[PDB]
Design an enzyme around this catalytic site. Structure first.
Site, PDB file in Angstrom:
ATOM      1  N   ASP A  67     -23.621  11.740 -22.462  1.00 20.11           N
ATOM      2  CA  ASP A  67     -22.774  12.924 -22.375  1.00 20.11           C
ATOM      3  C   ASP A  67     -23.375  13.918 -21.383  1.00 20.11           C
ATOM      4  O   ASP A  67     -24.588  14.114 -21.354  1.00 20.11           O
ATOM      5  CB  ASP A  67     -22.621  13.585 -23.741  1.00 20.11           C
ATOM      6  CG  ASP A  67     -21.847  12.733 -24.714  1.00 20.11           C
ATOM      7  OD1 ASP A  67     -21.525  11.582 -24.368  1.00 20.11           O
ATOM      8  OD2 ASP A  67     -21.560  13.218 -25.827  1.00 20.11           O
TER       9      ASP A  67
ATOM     10  N   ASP B 251      -9.950   7.972 -31.743  1.00 26.14           N
ATOM     11  CA  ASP B 251     -10.693   8.285 -32.955  1.00 26.14           C
ATOM     12  C   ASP B 251      -9.845   7.889 -34.152  1.00 26.14           C
ATOM     13  O   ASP B 251      -8.656   8.222 -34.215  1.00 26.14           O
ATOM     14  CB  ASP B 251     -11.045   9.768 -33.027  1.00 26.14           C
ATOM     15  CG  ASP B 251     -12.092  10.175 -32.004  1.00 26.14           C
ATOM     16  OD1 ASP B 251     -12.737   9.281 -31.420  1.00 26.14           O
ATOM     17  OD2 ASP B 251     -12.280  11.393 -31.797  1.00 26.14           O
TER      18      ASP B 251
END
Length: 225
Positions: free
Chosen positions: A7, A118
């Site tokens: 990230d 998700d």
């Protein structure tokens, strides 16, 4: 395959320092065939998309990079591809505007796009899609959304359990023409072994690598058995 992940916020790995390039190069030197990057700055504000940094990272390794974070428009996709990314990771937009994203499959090709979903298993055992950990379910199951995109040649799906080996066995078996990636739940090397027999095609590993639980090399050896 093992898919190492980083990230990025304003050039910084998340706080694991601000030099992602040597890290990514070493991930590739150990045998990674694909890398995963999330542009957290771009996710927060697409006008501040870290395009310059992404160009540099992509230029600095020899393997395809899939990149996500605030990919909201056709122009976002095009900009990332032009910067040299191999595949663009589509998340919230894939849930909110399926007809528009189907157009993107038509324009760019399924090889260029990864749908990141998700998933929460609810009380009735349904795999609910949600656009993030912070938000309620969106009222569409993983199966319904996958089947929405199959007629435009969907090939890559990245599935994160935000509520499971059984989950991956089921969806992989149901859609063998799709290459599923799993994300989350890798706390140690045994978690990689647990995914081997499931039909998952790729395993995203981020935090465990950063914390030094195991190396990319060891992950791949485990994964390839």
């Amino acid at each position: 395959m093992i898919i190492p992940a980083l990230d990025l916020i304003g050039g910084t790995v998340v706080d694991y320092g601000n030099d992602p390039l040597p890290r990514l190069q070493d991930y590739a030197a150990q045998g990674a065939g694909v890398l995963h990057l999330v542009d957290l700055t771009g996710a927060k504000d697409p006008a501040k998309r870290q395009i310059p940094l992404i160009k540099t990272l992509v230029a600095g390794v020899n393997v395809p990079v899939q990149v996500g974070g605030g990919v909201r428009t056709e122009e976002d996709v095009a900009a990332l591809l032009k910067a040299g990314v191999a595949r663009v990771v589509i998340a919230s937009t894939a849930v909110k505007s399926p007809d528009v994203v189907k157009g993107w499959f038509e324009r760019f090709g399924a090889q260029a796009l990864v749908l990141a979903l998700d998933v929460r298993i609810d009380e009735h055992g349904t795999k609910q899609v949600a656009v993030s950990g912070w938000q309620e379910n969106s009222g569409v199951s993983l199966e319904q959304l996958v089947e929405t995109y199959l007629p435009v040649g969907l090939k890559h799906v990245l599935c994160t359990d935000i509520s499971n080996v059984s989950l991956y066995e089921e969806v992989c078996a149901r859609y063998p023409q799709i290459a599923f990636q799993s994300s989350g739940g890798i706390g140690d090397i045994d978690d990689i072994a647990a995914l081997r027999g499931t039909g998952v095609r790729g395993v995203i590993v981020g935090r465990a690598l950063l914390e030094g639980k195991f190396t990319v090399k060891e992950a791949i050896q485990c994964w390839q058995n």
